[PDB]
Amino acid sequence: ALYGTRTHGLFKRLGIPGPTPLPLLGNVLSYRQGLWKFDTECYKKYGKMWGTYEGQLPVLAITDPDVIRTVLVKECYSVFTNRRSLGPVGFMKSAISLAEDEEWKRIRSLLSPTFTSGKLKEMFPIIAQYGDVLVRNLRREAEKGKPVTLKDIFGAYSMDVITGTSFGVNIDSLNNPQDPFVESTKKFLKFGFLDPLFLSIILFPFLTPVFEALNVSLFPKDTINFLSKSVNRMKKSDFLQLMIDSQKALSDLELAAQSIIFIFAGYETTSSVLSFTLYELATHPDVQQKLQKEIDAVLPNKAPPTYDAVVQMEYLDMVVNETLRLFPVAIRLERTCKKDVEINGVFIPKGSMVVIPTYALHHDPKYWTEPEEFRPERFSKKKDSIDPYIYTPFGTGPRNCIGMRFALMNMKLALIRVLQNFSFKPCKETQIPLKLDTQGLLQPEKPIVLKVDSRD
Numbered sequence: 096a097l098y099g100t101r102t103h104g105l106f107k108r109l110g111i112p113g114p115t116p117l118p119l120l121g122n123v124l125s126y127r128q129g130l131w132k133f134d135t136e137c138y139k140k141y142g143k144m145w146g147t148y149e150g151q152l153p154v155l156a157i158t159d160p161d162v163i164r165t166v167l168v169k170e171c172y173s174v175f176t177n178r179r180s181l182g183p184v185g186f187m188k189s190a191i192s193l194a195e196d197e198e199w200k201r202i203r204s205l206l207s208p209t210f211t212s213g214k215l216k217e218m219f220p221i222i223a224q225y226g227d228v229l230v231r232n233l234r235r236e237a238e239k240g241k242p243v244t245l246k247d248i249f250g251a252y253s254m255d256v257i258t259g260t261s262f263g264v265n266i267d268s269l270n271n272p273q274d275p276f277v278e279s280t281k282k283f284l285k286f287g288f289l290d291p292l293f294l295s296i297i298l299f300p301f302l303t304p305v306f307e308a309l310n311v312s313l314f315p316k317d318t319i320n321f322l323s324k325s326v327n328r329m330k331k332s333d334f335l336q337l338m339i340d341s342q343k344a345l346s347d348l349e350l351a352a353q354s355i356i357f358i359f360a361g362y363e364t365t366s367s368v369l370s371f372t373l374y375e376l377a378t379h380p381d382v383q384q385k386l387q388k389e390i391d392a393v394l395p396n397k398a399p400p401t402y403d404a405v406v407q408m409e410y411l412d413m414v415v416n417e418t419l420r421l422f423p424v425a426i427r428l429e430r431t432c433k434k435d436v437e438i439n440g441v442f443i444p445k446g447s448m449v450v451i452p453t454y455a456l457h458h459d460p461k462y463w464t465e466p467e468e469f470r471p472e473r474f475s476k477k478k479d480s481i482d483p484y485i486y487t488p489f490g491t492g493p494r495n496c497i498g499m500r501f502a503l504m505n506m507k508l509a510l511i512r513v514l515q516n517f518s519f520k521p522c523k524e525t526q527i528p529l530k531l532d533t534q535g536l537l538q539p540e541k542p543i544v545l546k547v548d549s550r551d
């Protein structure tokens with residue numbers, strides 16, 4: 096059984112500290128507390144650089160901004176181009192989040208004109224039309240005299256926007272739970288929990304070819320089929336339309352992968368940050384009232400938002416940027432060495448992983464005074480510019496979040512509407528302080544519920 100004790104002497108030899116890996120498992124057992132908790136604990140114990148093992152895969156965490164800049168920007172195309180080892184994914188191998196090396200550079204180049212600020216300005220009325228249904232669905236829950244579970248309200252809004260901006264179909268997620276789009280896309284929420292299949296190829300990466308050969312995918316095969324068949328039937332009759340017009344050619348299999356992955360990526364994360372932003376505005380009433388004072392001063396008498404009004408709301412941008420500091424839903428940034436590389440005078444083998452602990456650097460007292468406190472004033476345009484390698488909620492470099500500007504616009508349009516019409520405050524069922532759960536996509540331990548009062 097030559098598999099278990101092959102690489103577990105690397106960091107010990109290189110002089111890089113870290114937790115003691117168990118045979119076969121590595122340090123994988125330490126993840127059960129959540130990657131956010133494991134990363135902060137390692138940061139406090141070892142410092143600038145530590146080393147863990149996902150099975151037999153060596154993982155080197157780095158916290159020096161000069162080193163982060165080299166891995167995310169300088170040597171991106173040359174060493175650290177790909178994110179994590181390929182797993183059994185089927186045709187989703189052409190998804191932009193999975194594509195590697197030259198194939199990723201090509202797919203990223205084709206999709207880049209779709210997510211420019213110019214195309215976002217053209218789609219602004221499309222995104223904004225989903226604010227009405229959000230305010231309406233939130234109005235009835237407010238007049239019921241009962242608390243509002245934010246994940247159901249903004250989860251439905253996030254699915255509505257991401258599907259409407261992808262296919263042009265105006266789903267009413269909250270009022271049509273039995274819709275096939277809603278039930279299929281709902282299964283994406285299981286992402287973030289324990290995945291034995293994903294963990295099996297982590298500990299035994301040689302199983303990835305076997306699973307592919309047996310047509311086993313890390314994605315919900317039923318949901319991937321519904322979306323792929325839905326994408327095809329629509330092409331006979333938008334993110335989809337922008338990708339059809341672009342047809343270096345984007346194949347039919349590749350385009351179906353990008354449509355699916357954009358829905359997968361935008362659904363829960365947008366829903367999660369939107370709930371975190373409202374929790375902070377409720378537990379900080381003066382922060383909420385000041386933000387309401389800004390929206391009303393720019394948009395008088397509940398005026399419909401325009402692009403220029405949304406972009407020129409500074410205090411709205413500060414609140415969102417601070418919610419993302421406290422809760423970067425993608426806890427960390429990961430990269431793979433496509434060759435033997437020397438990082439900060441340390442020789443790292445090919446295929447090893449480099450983790451930028453975003454969450455740990457976001458709560459570091461060395462960079463943020465009172466790091467556990469929601470202070471939007473950190474992102475005031477008068478202070479010194481925040482380090483782009485310490486604050487990395489969307490990552491940095493050629494391979495950062497391609498939908499960063501879209502997600503920020505999608506959330507702000509929602510925040511402006513709900514604040515134009517409602518105020519938010521806690522109640523007996525609200526957890527203070529907020530306890531994060533162990534899920535790999537940041538979620539609270541108990542669902543956020545807030546009292547929603549209309550301003551009229």
Ligand code: HEM
Nearest residue numbers: 191192360361364425488489490491494495496497498502
């Ligand atoms: C506020 C919500 C969001 C957060 C916090 C977020 C966060 C991230 C992060 C941290 C990465 C990794 C970047 C890196 O490795 O440096 C990423 C990648 C990505 N995100 Fe997002 N994201 C969000 C919303 C979205 C939305 C709405 C979309 C879809 C339009 C999206 C699509 C992607 C894709 C496709 C990638 C992979 C980029 C690539 O590998 O080329 N994300 N996101």
Ligand SMILES: CCCCCCCCCCCCOCCOCCOCCOCCOCCOCCOCCOCCOCCO
Nearest residue numbers: 123124126127128129285288289290291294295298533534
């Ligand atoms: C032929 C060879 C086959 C090889 C099979 C390999 C199987 C590997 C199994 C080892 C698992 C090791 O687990 C440690 C790593 O876990 C880290 C991530 O998990 C953190 C959260 O869960 C902690 C896991 O350990 C405690 C058990 O808790 C499980 C809770 O799962 C989430 C609960 O939610 C219910 C399930 O999800 C539905 C969500 O709607």
Ligand SMILES: Clc1ccccc1C(c1ccccc1)(c1ccccc1)n1ccnc1
Nearest residue numbers: 179180181182184192193286290293313314
């Ligand atoms: Cl599909 C995949 C293959 C290899 C590594 C990571 C992923 C990942 C995923 C998605 C669904 C189920 C299991 C793994 C993944 C899992 C955790 C963190 C990042 C990526 N993925 C999501 C988008 N593109 C790839």
Ligand SMILES: Clc1ccccc1C(c1ccccc1)(c1ccccc1)n1ccnc1
Nearest residue numbers: 126129130287288289290293294533534535
């Ligand atoms: Cl276990 C693991 C290792 C490396 C990357 C991601 C994961 C992940 C996870 C989830 C919750 C707490 C710790 C790690 C994970 C993180 C984000 C999204 C999906 C899975 N996981 C893989 C299989 N089961 C769980």
Ligand SMILES: Clc1ccccc1C(c1ccccc1)(c1ccccc1)n1ccnc1
Nearest residue numbers: 178192356359360361364424425496535536
């Ligand atoms: Cl892009 C993507 C698609 C499908 C599932 C997950 C993700 C991803 C993510 C988010 C939170 C926790 C783990 C992975 C992700 C996939 C791959 C690499 C980084 C992040 N993501 C959603 C939005 N922006 C990025």
